[PDB]
């Protein structure tokens, strides 16, 4: 469930609803913790593939450099430690959507293979010469500017244009201030639902405190402040702290 | 299919037509996304070999450092990782055309080997002294200035001459604006036909917006702009953006 | 047992009691030797998991680069050296508390692995695809500015926010001086009980000497001074030394 | 066959004919595309050894660092990868001529080996102790200044003298312009004969265009311009291009 | 046997007597050859562990890496070369004292391991998951300055405080000139007993020569001078030479 | 055999005759192509060991750094590629003379082993433990100043004194012009006899041309010029080429 | 046989005589070609161990950096290439004297191993746990200022003192020019005896040449001149070449 109240955010929402009906690649941009991931999940559920699989892979969080292995999958003995066969992420997303979180940090080599997959609608596992027809909708996410990455030599131009037909950008939280109260309430309800507890309320004062803070860490940071506030138990007074904790 | 409308592109088309009749090596130049690939396909379809195989190998996209192994093919156990025999690209192009896409990414080592293939009209697979006679027409493309690439010592001179007997160059898309509107109509058409959507038209004011943009990314960028316009939806108007998305 | 006497430490204590009640990640900050480890054990014992296991891992003291192996455990064969299967730390801390001591020293590869565990509440050993459900409360300590570490690119930002919902910070000893005497007495006592020696007191002049020193090393340095003083012998007078009375 | 018309070339030719009659080492110099290769072939055919084998090895074109292996041959086992025995090029050249194309690319190690072969008129394969008696006339070419190479420490002086008893140098094409018209016709003829067609002719206007170009690529570049002209089609006219068009 | 005569040394000996009876870690400092080792042996004999083993391991004289191996011990096949099982130094020191000579030279890695042993009073061999309970008194010497080493990033702070509860420091020999005559006689004596010679005396004038020299190499240098004097020969008489001739 | 005509070379020759009679190590010095090699053979043939083997080894010409292995010999196993046993150059020179040509090129390590052999008069092959007794006279040449090379730390001092009891130095060819014409005729005759041709003479103006050149490559370069001359052809006139210039 | 004439050298000789009688470590210093190894043998023969073994090892002349292995000895398979057992130089010195020639070029690791052997009077071979009791008198030479190497960090201070209780230093040949005529004569005799030939005399003329030369390489250089002079056959007469000609 995605909270949208600010008029810039409704604009975003209506853009997203448009692409979500289609099978175009969606590039979801925005600063840290600004909600790129809930947007990607929103588009899947808004899309005609809603009932199909939703597979995510964070290319910025895959240790041991198993990014290529995770993506394409592999056969037993495709490399050191390949002790078994293993389907790629694309295989799991058949008939649904795949989310490439942070394609920016994918290496050039891997970008090449990914491009071919996008061009061919096919994929082979590492160690395999057998092709697999894909019916997969593609979403991607980036924290960097891909254009600048292309200009800087770290990203392929052709891969760029393919992934960026329809880019969606979250404004930073301080640019869409009307989202703050609705978001704050949501995060409170969220957390309290988890713990069987009834949701408390937030003092006007506390709300004001939340409104006049620029939120460098955006909605992630807000969520942090909200959870903190609940520990200083259930309400919302000046139980909000940002930078004097 | 290749659209041509601008009289610059017609002169180019005319040149391609001349050389396509022959068996000469064709080098196809031009900026990124200007149509080097679709040109090379036109030359094949125009040539006496149109019914033969068209094999493309993109040196600028061959991952895992496999350019050599892909080009020449390999026998089983020719290197660590070669679990099977695999014919090279020239073998596949037997009786038709091979396309060496972005040959400037080829290192001096492989350049030497290619030169020998072009000289002897023969190739051997890695791990084999079996000499395979070829009848393969050669096309190539480059995003780089091959001439200066030779002077910088990254490309062999003798190869450069074998490859540049008949160079064809695409103008950047903004140097040939009469191509823009028929290209947009073409891109829209093929996108819609692929998706199975009825194909709409572009409003005149939308056409104007497209003509007064320089297209840094050329036809590729135009394709991108046009697919974006379609999503914004069917019958383009001011659903064109390039720098002001917002 | 944790000695608290200065009003700063009392405010800190009351905050600890607040989070202990909950299952929230607690981050413990403060200079070297200021009590971060004992505060961790305090929170576990104040928590409803106090009857459960307390498991500690000093990420800054795991030699032979076994920090990953120690945390997650490993099947036999997982790496050259792994002669046996071995349970990870999260495993041992099932139903209780794990303490991540000096978590800032954990590299970015490991940090990502950890994030996964916090996000999923599941862990697999090195060399295994077997996911193990965790019911484990997390505490972490750092004597580095984790906010700065994120800015230096040495620390994942998302990991940071997950670990810093409720940061608790020990002031340096020199800015909670009402802690100094009770601590000195505490350290003396526990050292003497341990050694089976009678425990002596401290003379007022020695107390004044302790209060007027800045404790660069904090409570650890105080413990040092006390133990040295006891060697010089029983019933401390100015038998205190720091720099330079030696 | 070799086209000679300029008096500089004719002077070359007379010199070439003088050495051809002998068994002297011959060093063939001059810029790129100026005919060093076709001169070496001429000398061999003018020599008493013309019925004998003619063996070229281009040291600047042997991929994979197989230069040592190619020249001396090898036995199975000799080096990792050598799956079989292989005769060297000197062996093949028995009773005739060998052409060491671009000797300046040989490393000092190989140079020491070449020197011993020249001194002793025998050779061993890599991996073998059997010396094979040689009766082979040596020709060589360089694109680089070898006397300079010696002074820069990159070429052995003793080898330099053995190989340079009689150096022959091609003038650049621009400084023997009487060659250009006959070469161009020879090249048109060459291309046409290879394709069954009759030779076209060159309009006086086209000749003049050819004559007032400096040919930085020498005869190789001229060949290029000739073939391009033939694709542009069969009666040289304004079908000649150099650096403004194609 | 340790000779003490200067009031500074006597102060030092009294402090030594105070720590000897305790189990406290002792750190012994001082310039080179100033008697750090003999103080170690003195503290042991003065301790209630006197009849216990006295084990030394100088980390500044251990050939190869090893050190970790010789300190902790190893099982067979614990690393390339470990051909037999070997007891560690700590193991050997059971019930007595271990002397970690020049601890400054341990790398951070091994420091962490050492730190674990001190905290836990347990050691494992390289290769074993089996920990051995220790009852070992610890001594250390260093040539470097440890606090500066800690500030340099080369020595762990926690290990430092643990090892440095009671640092004992030898003044340079020139700062305690009353030790010189009895040391001179003691060294002669011990040298002559060992060689089975009568022990000579030192003439008053030779004593003056010894007192008015700075002793850059302290007692070691003195031993050197005194052995030299004896070669020059018996009852010493301005048979004393220092650095600067004969 | 050796051509000597100039006053300086006759004196050098006389010095050679004195050592040749002895067993002393001889160091032969001089610029590139000035005849150090032919001087070696001269000393061997003038020595009482003339009937014995003359084994040479050019340390500046042995490919694949198999210098040490070639010197001392090796047993099957000593290193990889040592699929057989092989006698040393010292072993082959038993009863005769060994020539260490371009000895300035041995790495310091090889110098050490070389010193031991000269010290003890014994040699062991690589991978062996048996010392082989030696009766071998030693000759050495260098392009470098070994004195200089010692001060640069590239050449052992003790080895230097052992090899330089009696150094003989060829002056450059331009410093001994009376050698030029006898050499040129000797080089022609040698070349023509080998190829089975009549041997031509050199016209006086060709001699003159040859004398007024500084010969930076010395006798090697002379040999070169003279072989070029015979190709341009018979009875040498000014078919003499030197630099650029560039005739026929 | 040593041959000493200059009064500087007779002082040297008297000091030598004094250490020889003892078992003290002797450090022999002096410029290259001074006679350090001549003196080391003189010390052995003057000592009570004169009937025992005299084992020399040149640390600056051990190829294939086999110095450690040569010193301590080794068992089969102690290190690749060690196809057999081999006693150290200390072992074969048992009951006599070892000479460590050029001990400055021993590395720090080996120095530590050397210190241990001198402290414990024991050695064990490479690849062996068994320690061999030693009764070996130690001599050593150095071309370098060891004190300075200690200051430069290349030589252990503790080893330096153990080895330098009694340094003997040769003056350069030019500082003790009375040695020059007797040494020259001794060397002519030497060389003539090895060849089985009558020894000739040197013209005073020639001797004067010998005394007015600074002998940069000392007695070894003088040797070269004398041998050279004799090739310019037998009767030194200004068959003397140095750096005049
Ligand atoms: N519009 C929204 N409605 C509801 N929850 C939201 C919204 N935006 C953000 N959140 C929540 O706030 C946090 C934002 O994190 P996230 O969706 O991961 O943003 P992000 O841009 O992907 N961060 P990252 O990729 O690490 O730079 C998550 O806990 C979301 O559940
Ligand atoms: N004249 C044309 N007619 C039709 N489609 C065209 C034309 N020119 C370019 N395109 C399309 O534009 C896109 C760009 O790819 P391509 O045309 O082959 O350019 P390119 O020069 O090879 N790009 P690159 O090699 O990556 O620098 C493709 O989708 C082509 O189909
Ligand atoms: N409030 C306290 N009550 C009792 N003991 C304390 C207290 N504070 C510190 N100590 C003791 O003094 C020493 C301080 O150590 P510790 O708790 O490890 O601090 P730390 O912050 O974790 N040091 P570090 O190693 O830099 O991470 C230990 O012996 C503690 O047991
Ligand atoms: N005199 C000539 N007569 C006929 N063809 C010639 C002549 N000179 C050059 N050519 C042709 O020009 C081209 C280049 O000649 P080539 O013998 O390769 O010169 P090159 O100096 O060896 N080139 P390179 O080795 O790369 O520096 C070939 O096609 C030759 O056939
Ligand atoms: N007080 C003392 N009484 C008797 N002998 C002493 C005394 N001090 C030093 N020595 C002797 O002097 C020498 C050097 O002493 P030592 O204990 O080795 O000093 P050190 O400081 O530990 N050397 P180092 O660690 O290398 O700087 C040894 O021979 C000792 O036995
Ligand atoms: N005096 C001479 N008599 C006869 N032939 C000579 C004479 N001097 C030189 N030569 C010949 O001219 C050439 C000179 O070469 P060489 O004798 O090898 O001199 P080198 O000093 O050893 N050259 P290098 O080792 O390269 O510095 C050889 O071909 C010799 O045979
Ligand atoms: N006093 C001497 N009496 C007799 N022979 C001497 C004397 N001094 C030197 N020699 C001889 O002259 C040479 C000097 O060499 P040596 O005795 O090895 O001195 P060295 O200082 O050890 N040279 P090195 O080890 O290479 O630095 C040898 O040939 C000695 O035999
Ligand atoms: Mg993300
Ligand atoms: Mg391309
Ligand atoms: Mg800690
Ligand atoms: Mg060539
Ligand atoms: Mg010590
Ligand atoms: Mg030579
Ligand atoms: Mg020596």
Assess whether B96 and B61 both reside in one domain: yes
Q: CA-CA distance, B3 to B219, in Å (whole number)?
A: 11
Joined tokens for residue D176: 């023997």
A120 and A232 in one domain?
Answer: no
* A103 and A224 assigned to the same domain: no
What are phi and psi for residue G143, nearest 5 degrees?
-90, -15
Determine the atom of ligand 6 nearest the C-alpha atom of F4.
1
Task: Considering only the C-alpha atoms of chain D, give the largest distance between any 2 of them, rounded to a whole number of Å.
Answer: 64
Q: Do the beta carbons of residue B115 and residue B158 sit within 8 Å?
A: yes
E strand spans, F41-87: 54-58, 73-74, 86-87
Question: Are the C-beta atoms of A35 and A219 separated by less than 8 Å?
Answer: yes
G110's tokens: 């080996």
User: In terms of DSSP H, where are the helices of B86-177?
Assistant: 89-92, 108-120, 146-151, 157-163
Q: Which value, in Å, is the radius of gyration of the alpha carbons in chain D?
A: 21
Lookup: tokens for A152: 């800087």
* SS3 of residue C225 by DSSP: helix
**Ligand 11 center to F61 CA (angstroms):** 27
CA-based end-to-end distance of chain A: 31
Contact E46, E20 (CB under 8 A): yes
Please check whether residues A148 and A35 belong to one and the same domain. yes
Do F131 and F60 lie in one domain? The reply is yes
Supply the range of the domain harboring residue D91: 1-173
Residue E29 to residue E167: CA distance in whole angstroms: 7
Give the C-alpha separation, D51 to D63, whole Å.
30
Taking the centre of ligand 11 as the mean of its atom positions, its distance from the CA of residue D140, in whole angstroms, is 9
> Which of B64, B217, B224 comes nearest A109 by C-beta?
B64
Q: Would strands D132-133 and E137-142 be described as parallel, antiparallel, or unpaired?
A: unpaired
Residues flanking ligand 5, CB < 6 Å? E 2-3, 30, 32-38, 141, 143, 186, 219-220, 223; G 158
Of B217, B231, B232, the CB nearest to A161: B217
Task: Let me know whether B58 and B148 are in one domain.
Answer: yes
DSSP, residue by residue, B157-210: HHHHHHH-SSEEEPPPGGG-GGGHHHHHHHHHHHHHHHHTPPP--B-HHHHHHH
Residue the block writes with tokens 């990889």: F80
Q: CATH code at B207?
A: 1.10.8.60
CA pair distance C158, C161, nearest whole angstrom: 5
Which tokens sit at A139? 């979403």
The whole-angstrom separation of Cα E109 and Cα C114 is 23
Helices of type H across D48-141: 67-72, 89-92, 108-120
Mark whether E203 and E213 lie in a shared domain.
Answer: yes
Identity of the residue in C112, C166, C169 whose CB atom sits nearest the CB atom of A61: C112
Q: Are strands G97-101 and G137-141 parallel, antiparallel or unpaired?
A: parallel
Ligand 5: atom nearest CA of E38 is 17
Last residue of a domain, one of B173, B205, B236: B173
Picking from B18, C152, A105, the residue whose alpha carbon sits closest to that of residue D230 is: B18
> By CB neighbour count within 10 A (0-12 exposed, 13-18 middle, 19+ buried), where does B227 fall?
buried
Cβ contacts of A215 within 8 Å, gap of 6 or more: A172, A173, A174, A180, A221, A222
Deposited resolution, Å: 2.6
Burial level of D133, CB count in 10 A (0-12/13-18/19+)? exposed
Which helix (DSSP H) or strand (DSSP E) does residue F220 occupy? helix F218-232
Domain match, B29 and B100 both: yes
Between CA D144 and CA D32 the distance in angstroms is: 10
Largest CA distance in chain E: 64
Residues D154 and D188 in one domain: no
Residue with token string 């290496």: A107
Calpha distance G215→G172 (Å, rounded) = 8
Q: Would the CA dihedral through F72, F76, F79, F81 be positive or negative?
A: positive
Ligand 2 atom 27, closest CA: B32
Residues of F in contact with D22 (CB under 8 A): 231
Count of positions (residues) in chain G: 245
How many angstroms separate the CA atoms of D222 and D3, rounded? 13
CA G158–ligand 12 middle distance (angstroms)? 9
Alpha carbon dihedral C17, C23, C24, C28, in 10-degree steps, equals 50
- Residue E217: both structure tokens together: 């190499």
Rounded to the nearest 5 degrees, what angle is found at the Cα of C177, between the Cα atoms of C228 and C224? Answer: 15
The answer to whether F124 and F11 are in contact (CB under 8 A) is no
Query: CB of D74 within 8 A of CB of D85?
Result: yes
Query: Rounded to the nearest 10 degrees, what angle do helices B218-232 and A7-20 cross at?
Result: 100
> Reduced to 3 states, what is the DSSP secondary structure of residue B24?
coil
The dihedral formed by the CA atoms of E11, E16, E19 and E23, expressed in degrees to the nearest 10: 170
d(CA G111, CA G154): 10
G contacts of F82 (beta carbons < 8 Å): none
Does residue C132 sit in the same domain as residue C201? no
Q: What kind and span of H or E run contains E18?
A: helix E7-20
Best residue among E37, E42, E191 to mutate for probing ligand 5's pocket (most ligand atoms within 8 Å of CB) is E37
d(CA B12, CA B3) in angstroms, rounded, equals 12
Q: How many other CB atoms are found less than 10 A from the CB of residue C80?
A: 6
Cβ contacts of C112 within 8 Å, gap of 6 or more: A61, A62, A63, C156, C159
What is the spatial distance between Cα F94 and Cα C30, in angstroms, rounded to a whole number? 82
E155 contact partners, CB below 8 Å, separation of at least 6: E104, E108, E111, E146, E149
Burial letters F189-224, b for 16+ CB under 10 A, else e: eeebeeeeeeebebeeebbebbeebebebbbbbbbb
Look up the CATH number of the domain holding residue B148. Answer: 3.40.50.300
Cβ atoms of C97 and C144 within 8 Å: the answer is: no
Q: Are A21 and A137 in contact (CB under 8 A)?
A: no
Structure token digits, residue A39: 């947007």
Distance in angstroms (rounded) separating the CA atoms of residues D224 and A2? 66
Q: If you write DSSP's letter for every residue of chain G in order, what string do you get? A: -----SHHHHHHHHHHHHHHTS---EEEE-STTS-HHHHHHHHHHHSTTTTS-EEEEETTS-GGG-HHHHHHEE-TTSSTT--S-EE-HHHHTTTSEEEEETGGGS-HHHHHHHHHHHHHTEEE-BT---EEE---EEEEE-SS-HHHHHHHTSS-HHHHHHH-SEEEEPPPGGG-GGGHHHHHHHHHHHHHHHTT-PPP---HHHHHHHHTS--TTHHHHHHHHHHHHHHS-SS-SS---SS--
Domain boundary among C142, C173, C204: C173
Query: Distance from the CA of A27 to the center of ligand 8, in angstroms?
Result: 12
Alpha-carbon gap, residue C81 to E147, rounded angstroms = 36
Other CB atoms within 10 A of residue D1 CB: 8
Name the maximum alpha-carbon separation found in chain B: 63
DSSP annotation string for C168-213: EEPPPGGG-GGGHHHHHHHHHHHHHHHHTPPPP-B-HHHHHHHHTS
Q: Tokens in use for F182?
A: 């006898």
Strands A132-133 and A122-123: antiparallel
DSSP F198: P
The distance of Cα E193 from the centroid of its chain, to the nearest Å, equals 23
Method: X-ray
User: How many domains, chain E?
Assistant: 2
Can you tell me the distance from the alpha carbon of G60 to that of G144, in angstroms, rounded to the nearest whole number? 12
Listed in sequence order, the residues at least 6 apart from C149 whose beta carbon sits closer than 8 Å to its beta carbon are C104, C155, C160
Token pair for A169: 């950008």
Domain boundary among F152, F173, F194: F173
**Which of E43, E48, E112, E125 to mutate to test binding with chain C, by most C CBs within 10 Å of its CB?**
E112
Structure tokens at G55: 């084992």
Residues of chain B in contact with residue A109, where contact means CB-CB under 8 angstroms, are 63-64
**Per-residue burial over B57-72, b = 16 or more CB atoms within 10 Å of its CB, e = otherwise:** bbbbbbbeeebbbbbb
Same structural domain for residues G164 and G226?
no
CA–CA distance, B151 with F46 (Å, rounded to integer): 59
Burial class (CB in 10 A: 0-12, 13-18, 19+), G223: buried
User: CB neighbours of B178 closer than 8 A, spacing ≥ 6?
Assistant: B5, B6, B7, B9
Distance CA G173, CA F218 (A): 41
Q: Are both A95 and A199 inside the same structural domain?
A: no
Both structure tokens of C121: 């509440």
Q: Do chains G and D touch (3 or more CB pairs under 8 A)?
A: no
* CA–centroid distance, residue F122 to ligand 14 (Å): 20
Two tokens, residue C52: 């459960």
Residues with CB under 6 Å of ligand 2 are: A 158; B 2-3, 30, 32-38, 143, 186, 219-220, 223
Residue labelled with tokens 């042995």: F62
d(CA F230, CA D165): 10
DSSP string, D5-57: -SHHHHHHHHHHHHHHTS---EEEE-STTSSHHHHHHHHHHHSTTTTS-EEEE
Q: How far is A65 from A94, CA to CA, in rounded Å? A: 24
């Amino acid at each position: 469930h995605m909270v949208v109240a600010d008029t810039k955010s409704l604009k975003l929402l209506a853009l997203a609803d448009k692409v979500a009906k289609t099978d175009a690649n969606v590039m979801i941009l925005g600063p840290s913790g600004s909600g790129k991931e809930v947007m990607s999940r929103y588009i899947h559920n808004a899309s005609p593939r809603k009932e199909g699989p939703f597979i995510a892979i964070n290319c910025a969080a895959i240790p041991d450099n198993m990014l290529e292995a995770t993506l394409f999958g592999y056969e037993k003995g495709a490399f050191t430690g390949a002790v078994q066969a293993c389907p790629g992420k694309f295989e799991q997303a058949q008939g649904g959507t795949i989310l490439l979180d942070e394609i920016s940090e994918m290496d050039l080599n891997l970008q090449a293979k990914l491009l071919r997959v996008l061009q061919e609608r096919e994929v082979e596992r590492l160690g395999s010469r057998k092709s697999i027809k894909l019916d997969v909708r593609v979403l991607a996410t980036s924290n960097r500017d891909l254009k600048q990455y292309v200009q800087a030599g770290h990203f392929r131009e052709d891969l760029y244009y393919r992934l960026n037909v329809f880019p969606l950008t979250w404004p930073a939280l301080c640019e869409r201030k009307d989202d703050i109260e609705p978001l704050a309430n949501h995060l409170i309800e969220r957390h309290c639902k988890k713990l069987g507890l009834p949701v408390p309320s937030i003092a006007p004062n506390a709300i004001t405190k939340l409104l006049n803070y620029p939120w460098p860490g955006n909605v992630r940071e807000l969520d942090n402040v909200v959870q903190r506030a609940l520990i200083l138990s259930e309400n919302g007074h000046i139980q909000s702290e940002h930078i004097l904790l």
